[PDB]
Amino acid sequence: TRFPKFSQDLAQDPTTRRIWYGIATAHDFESHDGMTEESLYQKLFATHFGHLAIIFL
């Protein structure tokens, strides 16, 4: 069960808790597997562009 790919703790859960917690922790980028500080700020900068674009749409 590869969703959620950012958390192998959640991905190996065999229950429906895997789906709910994958949704709830998806934007908690600091707690994801393999996250570094530099890749966090780079992901945020681009995510903020996407949120800006939603405001203009």
Binding site: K43, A46, T47, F49, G50, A53, L57
Partner: peptide
């Protein structure tokens, strides 16, 4: 008024924003 040509133009602009959103959302994942 917003003529039928202008609705069609707006969907073409929206399609280009759609593929741009598609580029960003796959680069984010």
């Amino acid at each position: 008024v917003v003529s039928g040509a202008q609705v069609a133009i707006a969907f073409v602009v929206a399609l280009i924003a759609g593929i741009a959103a598609l580029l960003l959302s796959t680069a984010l994942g």
